[PDB]
Write a protein that binds this ligand. Structure first.
Ligand code: NDP
Ligand code: SF4
Ligand code: SF4
Ligand code: SF4
Ligand code: FES
Ligand code: ZN
Lengths: 57, 47, 123, 55, 117, 692, 68, 123, 80
């Protein structure tokens, strides 16, 4: 049904910005921009799904 | 709304199309492969 | 050369304002593969107002240029030129650049120093 | 292609001091930069006015 | 909290909504876009709208900083980040962290810091 | 002179003594590898290029097995496919699971060869597991994550051989071998961002482009590099409004696959302090403004000042387009004033050598020709800083051959070995008479490099007199088939400006201007422009030169425009536009074309093809892109550049100074970038950088 | 249908047998923050607003003048 | 589909230039005979001689084409267009594709000079 | 004001202009000290001189010629 970005136990965003969900999406619904944050950890600055062009594959 | 019909305009997108074909392999992925030509239908080597 | 641009259905704007480029793709400095460096690509030069701009809303890359994602592959350079002036397009062609052949020996690495060494190899 | 016919130019400053860079070609998916409030846009004039404004 | 609305107008929002999250006030990326930035850019469409039912979901950069640091006696520290009540493969790929430098070395998938002792 | 053998049934002929991998590349046969490279030495580390060779018991390494006649080579042997799967599985056992977080996702050599040649599954499942390598802080430009290293030695071979920085190495035995400085020493060299395109895995990678983007998303664009003497070839990767990285495409003449540090990491300053709208000074404050406002302010100030002639200065700068120089020169000379100067100190006069006879101001031997050199000397330059790729050329030819160097100028720390001669024009002339008249007269292919830093000296003509007399007197340095007098030019615009004739006259150097035009032109001082003068700065980002202006006009930088550029060798090369000018910036010749209409000048072109036609009218070697011509006028040009400063300039005893103060911040983009800002402090003389 | 709690929503649709008060301590997910449950606010003024998560991609210049 | 549509023609290619000129003039006659049923059929604002001047203008676009095959492909496209317009298959919104110029004035500030093209960078 | 001309380097229809270079450069420079000379070379070019007078007015001649006194004559003609 609808989409959700999960979190770890003890609250961490899980999205390591690997761009795989963007690379595979058959209808180009995902758009991501990614930057290294203050920790030096790799996270998404920007995550986005258009649910009008999502196809639920 | 002015002409009260649909109009056909030159194209413009709110999100531009992103092809990911740029970013294919740089190593050639499959070999030449073998043949299944029978020995009846290829040219004889001399001698 | 027959002029097919009137029977293609493409607008006059594309054949009279847009310049296109034939090029063979460079071997990447990243990896040692050379497979995408044989076909001749055909690719449109960008329009400076119509290329791309960021959206009000979310920051999607919006565009009014529509040939930005189209790119052609040809076997030959003369194939690309024949198709490009057959469709009536202004083209620039970019000549490829191969590597100069230089003879390598592994025994080059340890040849005898008569004077100053002037180098210390590692391996 | 489309074109901004309502605008004299691209970069327009307003008298309050706001700088407005219009983006892209003309038409639906691009933006001029102005923010307009049309009272009575339900009306017979205002429908045509903000049809021409949001175009 | 008053921010200038590109014209000399100052618009006023409650200060509980200028925080990135209710964990952290400041921004955690060099292009993270401050809440004062966002509200300065488009408040044409936060009009007639409740700021209360906006998401506000709890920045993880400080939820990871309050976790304790694990201590390993060996040379290399193993991490998968799985649960062990769940029947399956969850968590991230299994990576091995060197703990030799002074300080705590964090996992690049999960952020749990490991230290040699 | 050649050897004919057989690979895969194919019959191939190759020069004697070469490598079997070069035979395989000539025959079209694809052989996988990890520690072989064209511009590097041969090592047999990675064991990937094993190949079936008749009359050999074991599979031999194709990168270090030399070519012999009567050779029968097979690559599709079952033994060879088994060997490739074996060596791949051996490589993959200790290589960490970092593919979603590695920066080389769609660009990993290991990964693309693991599909094509490696095993399907993995048997590595010990409890003890893979080893772990400590992270090693090298410097601020190179992010370093060494769990995923495969010990290909390639970085070490490179920084040994070509970069001349011997601080890298391999310290240890077995799995406890590491690749880094042993002390945690910071790595300097003038090209240190080139080791991160070289590593096949992502162990050495880009620090400002740490995790920003991803190669299947990028759009690649083949352009030309400004802020370099040689004008190297690049590869702009664009998300589409932003610019991500530049990365070198190969050309064996101009850069030879290797590119400048300053060229690479100045993409940060491309997008940080940019001009996006025209601005008009009110008095102790700028305001931003309308195009009609700024351009009509220029027209009204022209009508108010009324410079009738020799009072409209128009000076260009470090990076400009040849077509923008066409626009500017045409606008000033259809105005009626050739006060048309270049930016450098002593740029107000003719630069002590001929705009006449192109071979006066060009690198006259080919850049490919330096490889043939025997004994060459430089005056007044540091080729380690300016044209850092030419330093790789000099050290490379000096390493392969018997080459002899000396230097006249400041005591430079080369990568290679110089001899010292002095700090004086008298030390120069003494060294020319004493030893090196004999050396350069003895040598077959010598040459002489002249820096353009001594062109900017007021005592230039004495140096050009002495060197022109020596080159005319010596028939070995100047003959038919090659030319030996050579100069370097700091900026990418100086050669194109001297092609077009962008230099003042003797009358124009006398007057003080009422209206000055800065097209680029960043290194102007406060005293160089008059206080009553109405200056306008056309440029792409804010700078020292933008601060002095009464009007600033945003332009397109080198990424955002397609442009002709001329290097020290003399190649005309086009940059393709990758992205568009952001906000409201426009193209540099179109802005001048539009300001002309508010003045009394109608420039005869109005489109890009007519700009190309007017460029061919200036000189047709600027529509002939990426070709190099010889010079039949090499004899006449040296005499014509000898006659001018003969006795007109007395050599003063001022010592020869260094041309640039730092390497990293020298033009409008590099001074704007925080990457060069935090790079120049970390690449200052510290304990982390002292060799000790 | 939007007013049902998530763990119960899977139960009403016959996904799970055991109701979410019947499941033991091990299945209840560990959290470091409170739970608040917004159902759906469509047509309600508490409807969601989308916006740009990041700042504009290319910076502009802060105007700095200089009296020569 | 053995029976064909009413205003059909079996597509046939001419080896002579003049018999194609015969067919072209017959086609012009068919178009201009059908201009009043186009005005009634598509409920247009204006009057019939503007349909007639557009038919003449769409033919004076393609007058100096030399190559006989390109004129054959042009004649076939034109007969297909006539068959769509006469059979009331096209609707008014696509019939008025032919008249982008006539419906409205699109606004002020038409860029003619280099500078008013420059002030909006061709928009 | 200044004058510039264009050769092709290899001896196709430009050798008389080329020896007019090699003997009359130094004579022309003190004939017109005010005036800059630009000489440029490329393989395909027809031998042509342009001269630029004041306020951006220039004109050109073609040098389809076989004599040094003839190109002398042609540049005599053009500076007037
Ligand atoms: N003959 C004409 O048509 C002429 C019209 N005008 C004037 O132009 C203007 C609009 O004319 P027109 O467009 O033709 O007719 P309208 O029907 O548009 O006039 C009413 C418009 O204003 C709104 N309106 C009226 N009273 C109120 C109110 N107390 N509160 C909020 N909104 C209200 C209406 O809302 P809602 O849509 O919900 O009904 C409607 O949008 C008027 O001022 C009119 O005097 C000028 C000369 C002649
Ligand atoms: S970027 Fe997408 S595919 Fe990658 S970890 Fe995040 S959610 Fe998963
Ligand atoms: S370098 Fe290694 S870890 Fe990184 S993407 Fe390639 S295979 Fe994966
Ligand atoms: S540092 Fe990189 S290039 Fe050098 S040996 Fe290790 S993996 Fe190879
Ligand atoms: S490349 Fe030949 S063995 Fe490493
Ligand atoms: Zn982990």
């Amino acid at each position: 049904g609808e989409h959700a970005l999960r979190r770890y136990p003890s609250g961490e965003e899980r999205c390591i910005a690997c761009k795989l969900c963007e690379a595979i999406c058959p209808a180009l619904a995902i758009t991501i921009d990614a930057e290294e944050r203050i920790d030096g950890s790799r996270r998404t600055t920007k995550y986005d799904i258009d649910m009008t062009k999502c196809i639920y594959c | 709304e002015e002409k009260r019909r649909v109009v056909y305009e030159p194209l413009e997108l709110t999100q531009a199309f992103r092809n990911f074909s740029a970013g294919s392999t740089a190593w050639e992925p499959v070999g030449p492969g073998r043949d299944d030509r029978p020995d009846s239908f290829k040219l004889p080597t001399p001698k | 050369v027959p002029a097919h641009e009137i029977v293609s259905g493409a607008p006059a704007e594309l054949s009279r304002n847009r310049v296109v480029r034939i090029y063979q793709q460079a071997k990447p400095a990243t990896q040692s593969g050379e497979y995408g460096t044989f076909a001749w690509r055909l690719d449109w030069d960008i329009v400076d107002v119509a290329n791309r701009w960021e959206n009000d809303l979310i920051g999607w890359q919006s565009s009014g240029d529509y040939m930005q994602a189209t790119q052609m592959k040809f076997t030959s350079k003369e194939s690309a030129i024949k198709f490009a002036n057959k469709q009536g397009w202004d083209f620039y062609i970019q000549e490829p650049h191969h590597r100069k052949f230089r003879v390598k020996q592994y025994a080059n690495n340890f040849v005898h120093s008569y004077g100053k060494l002037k180098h210390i190899r590692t391996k | 292609m489309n074109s901004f016919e309502n605008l004299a130019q691209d970069v327009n400053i307003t008298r309050s001091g706001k700088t407005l860079i219009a983006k892209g070609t003309g038409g639906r998916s691009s933006r001029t930069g102005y923010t307009a409030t049309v009272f009575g846009a339900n009306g017979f004039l205002g429908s045509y006015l903000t049809a021409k404004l949001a175009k | 909290k008053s921010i200038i609305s590109y014209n000399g107008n100052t618009i006023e929002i409650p200060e509980e909504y200028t925080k990135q999250a209710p964990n952290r006030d400041s921004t955690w990326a060099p292009a993270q876009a401050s809440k004062t930035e966002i509200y300065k850019n488009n408040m044409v469409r936060f009009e007639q709208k409740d700021l209360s039912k906006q998401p506000m979901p709890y920045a993880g950069i400080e939820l990871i900083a309050q976790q304790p640091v694990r201590f390993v006696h060996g040379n290399t520290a193993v991490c998968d980040g799985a649960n062990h009540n769940g029947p399956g493969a969850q968590g991230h790929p299994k990576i091995f962290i060197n703990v030799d430098a002074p300080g705590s070395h964090a996992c690049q998938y999960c952020g749990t810091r490991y230290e040699k002792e | 002179a050649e050897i004919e053998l057989t690979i895969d049934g194919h019959k191939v002929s190759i020069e004697a003594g070469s490598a079997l991998i070069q035979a395989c590349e000539k025959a079209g046969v694809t052989v996988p590898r990890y520690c072989y490279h064209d511009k590097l030495a041969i090592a047999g580390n990675c064991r990937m290029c094993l190949v079936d060779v008749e009359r050999a018991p074991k599979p031999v390494a194709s990168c270090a097995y030399p070519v012999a006649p009567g050779m029968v080579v097979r690559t599709d042997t079952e033994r060879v496919k088994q060997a490739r799967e074996n060596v791949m599985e051996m490589m993959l056992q200790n290589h960490p699971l970092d593919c979603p977080v590695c920066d080389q996702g769609g660009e990993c050599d290991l990964q693309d060869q693991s599909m094509r040649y490696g095993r399907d599954r993995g048997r590595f499942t010990e409890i003890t597991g893979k080893r772990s390598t400590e992270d090693k802080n090298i410097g601020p430009l190179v992010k370093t994550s060494m769990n995923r290293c495969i010990h290909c030695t390639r970085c070490v071979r490179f920084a040994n051989d070509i970069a001349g920085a011997p601080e890298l190495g391999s310290s240890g035995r077995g799995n406890d071998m590491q690749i880094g400085t042993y002390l945690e020493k910071n790595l300097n060299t003038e090209l240190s961002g080139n080791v991160i395109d070289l590593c096949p895995v992502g162990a050495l990678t880009n620090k400002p482009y740490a995790f920003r983007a991803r190669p299947w998303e990028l759009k690649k664009t083949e352009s030309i590099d400004v802020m370099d003497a040689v004008g190297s070839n690049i590869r702009i990767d664009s998300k589409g409004v932003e610019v991500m990285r530049v990365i070198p495409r190969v050309h064996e003449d101009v850069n030879e696959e290797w590119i400048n540090d300053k060229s690479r990491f100045a993409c940060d300053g491309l997008k940080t302090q940019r001009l996006t709208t025209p601005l008009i000074r009110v008095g102790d404050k700028f305001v931003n403004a309308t195009w009609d406002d700024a351009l009509s302010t220029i027209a009204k100030a022209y009508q108010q000042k009324a410079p009738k002639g020799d009072e409209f200065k128009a000076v260009a700068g470090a990076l400009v387009e040849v077509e923008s120089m066409v626009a500017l020169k045409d606008m000033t000379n259809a105005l009626g004033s050739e006060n048309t100067t270049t930016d450098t100190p002593n740029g107000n006069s003719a630069p002590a050598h001929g705009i006449t006879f192109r071979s006066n101001y060009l690198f006259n031997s080919s850049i490919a020709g330096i490889e043939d050199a025997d004994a060459i000397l430089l005056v007044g330059t540091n080729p380690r800083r300016e044209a850092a790729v030419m330093n790789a050329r000099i050290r490379k030819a000096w390493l392969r051959q018997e080459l002899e160097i000396a230097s006249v100028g400041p005591t430079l720390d080369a990568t290679f070995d110089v001899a010292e001669l002095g700090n004086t024009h008298a030390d120069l002339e003494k060294a020319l008479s004493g030893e090196f008249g004999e050396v350069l007269k003895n040598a077959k292919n010598p040459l002489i490099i002249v820096g353009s830093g001594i062109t900017d000296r007021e005592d230039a003509g004495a140096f050009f007199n002495t060197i022109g007399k020596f080159v005319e007197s010596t028939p070995s340095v100047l003959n038919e088939n090659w030319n030996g007098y050579n100069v370097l030019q700091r900026s990418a615009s100086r050669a194109g400006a001297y092609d077009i004739g962008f230099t003042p006259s003797d009358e124009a150097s006398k007057t003080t201007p009422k209206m000055v035009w800065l097209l680029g032109a960043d290194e102007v001082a406060a005293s160089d422009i008059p206080a009553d003068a109405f200056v306008v700065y056309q440029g792409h980002n804010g700078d020292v030169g933008a601060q002095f202006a009464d009007v600033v006009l945003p332009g397109a930088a080198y990424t955002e425009k397609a442009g002709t550029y001329v290097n020290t060798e003399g190649r005309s090369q086009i940059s393709r536009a990758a992205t568009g000018p952001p906000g409201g910036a426009r193209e540099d010749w179109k802005i001048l074309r539009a300001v002309s209409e508010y003045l009394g000048v109608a420039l005869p072109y109005e489109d890009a093809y007519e700009v190309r036609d007017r460029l061919a009218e200036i000189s047709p070697s600027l529509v002939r892109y990426d070709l190099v011509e010889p010079t039949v006028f090499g004899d006449v040009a040296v005499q014509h550049s000898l006659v001018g400063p003969n006795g007109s300039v007395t050599p003063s005893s001022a010592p020869l100074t260094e041309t640039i103060e730092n390497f990293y911040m020298t033009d409008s983009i590099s001074r704007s970038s925080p990457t060069m800002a935090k790079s120049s402090i970390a690449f200052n003389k510290d304990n982390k950088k002292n060799q000790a | 249908m939007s007013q049902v709690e998530p763990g119960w929503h899977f139960w009403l649709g016959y996904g799970v047998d055991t109701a979410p008060c019947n499941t033991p301590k091990e299945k209840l997910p560990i959290r470091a923050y409170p739970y608040k449950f917004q159902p759906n606010y469509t047509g309600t003024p508490g409807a969601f607003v989308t916006y740009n998560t990041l700042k504009p991609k290319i910076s502009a210049w802060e105007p700095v003048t200089k009296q020569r | 589909a053995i029976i064909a549509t009413a205003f059909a023609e079996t597509v046939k290619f001419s080896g002579s230039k003049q018999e194609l000129q015969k067919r072209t003039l017959a086609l012009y006659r068919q178009f201009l005979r059908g201009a009043p049923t186009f005005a009634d059929l598509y409920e247009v604002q204006f009057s019939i001689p503007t349909i007639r001047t557009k038919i003449r203008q769409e033919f004076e676009r393609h007058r100096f084409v030399d190559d006989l095959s390109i004129q054959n492909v042009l004649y076939a496209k034109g007969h297909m267009e006539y068959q769509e317009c006469i059979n009331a298959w096209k609707q008014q919104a696509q019939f008025l594709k032919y008249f982008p110029e006539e419906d409205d004035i699109q606004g002020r500030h038409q860029p003619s000079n280099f500078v008013d093209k420059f002030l909006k960078n061709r928009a | 004001r200044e004058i510039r001309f264009h050769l092709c380097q290899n001896g196709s229809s430009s050798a008389p202009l080329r020896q007019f270079v090699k003997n009359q450069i130094g004579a022309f420079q003190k004939a017109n000290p005010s005036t800059k000379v630009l000489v440029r070379e490329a393989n395909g070019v027809k031998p042509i001189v342009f001269a630029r007078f004041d306020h951006g007015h220039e004109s050109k001649i073609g040098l389809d010629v076989s004599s040094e006194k003839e190109v002398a004559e042609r540049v005599k003609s053009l500076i007037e």
